[PDB]
Design a binder for this molecule. Structure first.
Ligand SMILES: Nc1ccc(F)cc1C(=O)O
Ligand SMILES: Nc1ccc(F)cc1C(=O)O
Lengths: 265, 262
């Protein structure tokens, strides 16, 4: 991959692998989510980061995902080349945003798009805080000055408030535990694992007749290596829509809430 | 990737990804195992592939054994080159071997071998190969032996014993999710490597690095099955492994691992 001519975004190409495809012979949404994270990491590395800045490392401050929103129009097939362009943008003191555009390499068409909201937090105490001026100035040189949105629409799905699922759930998947392949280099559960855990409670019939179009996910609390999760789903709706809740098996403490939209094959 | 000049093997390069690395900032053995399978699939596709005779007779190739030896795990951002090739073992089945190299130095950083057997897709019955089907894949294999582990009496051909209860370590209630399934809805063979390593204690992960893993495949785990991973120390540190169904205790896999001090 490489930064574009103006140096304000990063582009990378990926060949879809055989173990990356699902039941439809096309890349899974988890595989796409991993590729979005991989291009994000290569963008951060290409501009000097390791995505903490000099001032963030001094204050023990990290960037944490608060929300992820993915919309796929066409999942790429095994052997296909997919091009992803990513860029960052400051949202004042609330935090930062990373947006992605997915394209089919041959036709040049937009086959998917994604947006994510990130917040600042102390690494040790887990306390969220507003972005300071010294931090904001350090990364503003790597972001486009005028707004560049992946979801520009006046009433886009990426900014909608997600409600809390009321018991009893229509569908559930109980006792989900992360293995070591679900952890990153710093031993934290990968943010992509929670997408998999959310989709564990979608019934087999929906998987058979429908294809996933949109997934919006709110991150409330992280799941530890020795924690156990319960994935809940209720139908809220041709198109099918769902409400999602991930919580700890014991106390019922919320770790994630979300929505999915499925279209008939 | 591409077939080599003689067309009897296939080479492919991979850039190690950020989500592919573990606690040591280097690619996991599961990531390596996925890359071995990915280069195997690209080799099969580049030569026309199951053969034509196998398709009408409802026959498939199934993994019976996997043996991986890693000398140096590649770091995030490193380019790793894998060369793979097939070879007939007469009527017993086929063998696929791999060699892993560091792209910059050209050194061998790892090697793997796998034994495959013929099986009816519907009845799950072994039944040896035939002779008619060999005159279809012998043209894609080197004629003289080409072994990834050539040494007479090496680790890749050793008989694995059955773990006796009580196990020293265990991890119970392991279930596959949809990301653990392949396009045909069968549990990925790499998931069982992860399930085996779930019962290695945290202390071994902290002080040691995995060098060798030999795995026997006895039975497949279904989408609605639950697994228990057992481990006992047999000794460098060496371990004996057993994966079995949570209920009846039916064996699905047995294995060994060898760990080197960091
Ligand atoms: N891999 C998956 C994960 C979740 C899901 F709901 C469906 C699939 C699939 O293979 O279509
Ligand atoms: N990913 C892993 C899976 C099993 C294991 F025993 C260790 C690791 C690691 O990150 O070193």
């Amino acid at each position: 991959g490489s930064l574009t001519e103006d140096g304000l975004s990063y582009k990378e190409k990926f060949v879809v692998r055989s173990y990356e495809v699902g039941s439809n012979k096309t890349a899974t949404v988890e595989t796409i989510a991993n590729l979005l994270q991989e291009v994000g990491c290569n963008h951060a590395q290409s501009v000097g980061f390791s995505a903490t800045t000099t001032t963030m490392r001094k204050l023990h401050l990290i960037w944490v995902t608060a929300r992820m929103h993915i919309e796929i129009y066409k999942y790429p097939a095994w052997g296909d080349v997919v091009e992803i362009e990513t860029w960052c943008q400051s949202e004042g003191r609330i935090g930062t945003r990373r947006d992605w555009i997915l394209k089919d390499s041959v036709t040049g068409e937009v086959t998917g798009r994604a947006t994510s909201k990130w917040v600042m937090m102390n690494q040790d105490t887990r306390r969220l805080q507003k972005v300071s001026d010294d931090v904001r100035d350090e990364y503003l040189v790597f972001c486009p000055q005028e707004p560049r949105l992946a979801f520009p629409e006046e009433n886009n799905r990426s900014l909608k408030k997600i409600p809390k699922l009321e018991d009893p759930a229509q569908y559930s998947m109980i006792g989900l535990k992360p293995r070591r392949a679900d952890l990153d280099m710093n031993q934290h559960v990968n943010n992509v694992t929670y997408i998999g855990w959310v989709l564990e409670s979608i019934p087999q019939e929906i998987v058979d007749t429908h294809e996933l179009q949109v997934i919006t996910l709110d991150y409330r609390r992280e799941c530890q290596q020795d924690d156990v999760v319960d994935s809940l789903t209720t139908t809220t709706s041709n198109d099918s829509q769902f409400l999602h809740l991930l919580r700890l098996s014991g106390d019922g403490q919320e770790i994630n809430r979300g929505t999915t939209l499925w279209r008939k094959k």
